[PDB]
């Protein structure tokens, strides 16, 4: 550990933007659409769409862990604490060569294969007061989730029920104990944000996460169900996360696509409610892959040599 006190701000961390831009370029030479449409305006309202048609090679895009080592004239500083807001003065900081192996998983609503919370479930937010700022949840115990191009994902109803609890409890432990915690599905928006979207085998899965976010701080949902089955769908025409615009990928082909990932975290986003009675409603969120990266770099910060 480094014997000094420094400031950290994962919400304004620059490595996030440095990885994000990398992960995008890690996408332009691995997953290339058959056609990519992107807004093109002079400002005069009228906006032509810039079209691009390239080969559409079916590749089973399988993410490789990524390290981030400071070159020279530069040093990475890691924060150490069982519960770090990731936005303030860190006491147990410590210089490191490369950040832990991170598997740049691009997804929405659920953070897959990320890094678990050592102690307990932690939830960071650039401002919990602002019903506009994504709440990044960090699970201390991942929940396996298996998706298949066959059309769905299975999740443990047990583990997910617990998780919502040990999350619902960490929420009121920030918005007011004497406050009811509820979970509802997406409010609306793009398919990629409304469902738990992500990529598996180069196939863009779109799983309906209603059964994962319709939890009332009162009842249950395990009648005749051992596992939660999200009705997933693979799309060819998708909205790009790298930049405003659609993109069409070629249909599936491999006799079988399969994924078994660790739900290591979520991206929630409680609704304003305009100071109404203690009844905070949290819904799935994300779509801004940087929050993802953040959830992984929340305790890092590269700095110039002295």
């Amino acid at each position, epitope marked *: *550990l*480094e*014997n*000094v*006190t*420094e*400031n*950290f*701000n*994962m*919400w*304004k*961390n620059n490595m*996030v933007e440095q990885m994000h831009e990398d992960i995008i370029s890690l996408w332009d030479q691995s997953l290339k659409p058959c056609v990519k449409l992107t807004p093109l305006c002079v400002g005069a309202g009228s906006c032509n769409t810039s079209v691009i048609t390239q080969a559409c090679p079916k590749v089973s895009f399988e993410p490789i862990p990524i390290h981030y080592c*400071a070159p020279a*004239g*530069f*040093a*990475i*500083l*890691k*924060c*150490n*604490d069982k*519960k*770090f*807001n*990731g*936005t*303030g*003065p*860190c*006491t*147990n*900081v*410590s210089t490191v060569q490369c950040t832990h192996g991170i598997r740049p998983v691009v997804s929405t609503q659920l953070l897959l294969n990320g890094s678990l919370a050592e102690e307990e479930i*932690v*939830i*960071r*937010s*650039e*401002n*919990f*007061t602002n019903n506009a*700022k*994504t*709440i*990044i949840v960090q699970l201390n115990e991942s929940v396996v989730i298996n998706c298949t191009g066959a059309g769905h994902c299975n999740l443990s109803k047990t583990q997910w029920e617990n998780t919502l609890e040990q999350i619902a409890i960490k929420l009121k432990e920030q918005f007011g104990n004497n406050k009811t915690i509820i979970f509802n599905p997406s409010s609306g928006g793009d398919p990629e944000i409304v469902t738990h979207s992500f990529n598996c085998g180069g196939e863009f899965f779109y799983c309906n996460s209603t059964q994962l976010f319709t939890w009332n701080d009162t009842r249950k949902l395990n009648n005749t169900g051992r596992n939660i089955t999200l009705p997933c769908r693979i799309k060819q025409i998708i909205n790009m996360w790298q930049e405003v615009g659609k993109a069409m990928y070629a249909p599936p082909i491999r006799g079988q696509i399969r994924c078994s990932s660790n739900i290591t975290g979520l991206l*929630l986003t*409680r609704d304003g409610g305009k100071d109404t009675n203690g009844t905070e409603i949290f819904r799935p969120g994300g779509g801004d892959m940087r*929050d993802n990266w*953040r959830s992984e770099l*929340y*305790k*890092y*910060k*590269v*700095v*110039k040599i*002295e």
Partner: antibody, heavy 132, light 109 residues
Framework: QIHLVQSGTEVKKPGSSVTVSCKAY?????????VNWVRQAPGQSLEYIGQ??????????HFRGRVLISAVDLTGSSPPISSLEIKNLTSDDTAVYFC??????????????????????WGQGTLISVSA | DIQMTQSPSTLSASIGDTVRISCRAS???????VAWYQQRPGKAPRLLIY???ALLGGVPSRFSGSAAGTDFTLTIGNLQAEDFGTFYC?????????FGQGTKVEVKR
């Protein structure tokens, strides 16, 4: 761009305790930035209080046993936050408390020397006025 | 702890002047672990120079730092309106870091 946003002014009775907060907008993680707290009594110069560095906290001789300093990484709703707790307030605790941040990522930088450092970003300050 | 004694307590200057503020450390500081800050009335200090002579990003180059023996000095060339206020030196050579008593720079008349 780093903006440090401290909690608001407080008026506190002697013997009481208070916790002041600091939201570190632009700060990634306190794994890469140290927090140093500092205070300035009215018409006085500045005095070091304590720090959290690499998730390890500590306090200067004059304040040891009376002060707890903590930090937590957060995202979405909030940026990373550090806080300073002060116990048994007296009149000579009345002052402006500043939270302060310095990146520790680059060992060669010269902003820091084995845990003792210069302070590159400052909050607005929070006045704690101690009075009956 | 290291004591920093700052000199002078106040000085009066005009726009366009060159100004010198000095700080004597009670011990030698081989590493040059010294910093200078500006504070304007009502506001938080700002770091101007660190490691004795290094300019922080965004600070005008009319500011410079120097050292001789146990003395460290801030120089301000072409004194400007926004420069008036109070300046502090700080050692971070040894724990705990400590500040000078400060120097007030006001307008000559």
């Amino acid at each position: 761009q780093i903006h440090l946003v401290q909690s608001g002014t407080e008026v506190k009775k002697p013997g009481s305790s208070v916790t002041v907060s600091c939201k570190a907008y632009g700060v990634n993680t306190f794994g890469l930035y140290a927090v140093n707290w500092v205070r300035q009594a009215p018409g006085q110069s500045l005095e070091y209080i304590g720090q959290i560095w690499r998730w390890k906290s500590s306090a200067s001789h004059h304040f040891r046993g009376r002060v707890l300093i903590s930090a937590v990484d957060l995202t979405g709703s909030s940026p990373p936050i550090s806080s300073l707790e002060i116990k048994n307030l007296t009149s000579d605790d009345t002052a402006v408390y500043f939270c302060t941040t310095t990146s520790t990522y680059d060992k060669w930088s010269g902003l820091h020397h084995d845990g003792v450092m210069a302070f590159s970003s400052w909050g607005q300050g929070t006045l704690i006025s101690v009075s009956a | 702890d290291i004591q920093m004694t700052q000199s002078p307590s106040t000085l009066s200057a005009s726009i366009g002047d060159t100004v010198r503020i000095s700080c004597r450390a009670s011990q030698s500081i081989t590493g040059n672990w010294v910093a200078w800050y500006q504070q304007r009335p009502g506001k938080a200090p700002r770091l101007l120079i660190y490691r004795g002579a290094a300019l922080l990003g965004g600070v005008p180059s009319r500011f410079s730092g120097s050292a001789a023996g146990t003395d460290f000095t801030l120089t301000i060339g072409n004194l400007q309106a926004e420069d008036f206020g109070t300046f502090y030196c700080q050692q971070y050579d040894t724990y705990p870091g400590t500040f000078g008593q400060g120097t007030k720079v006001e307008v000559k008349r």
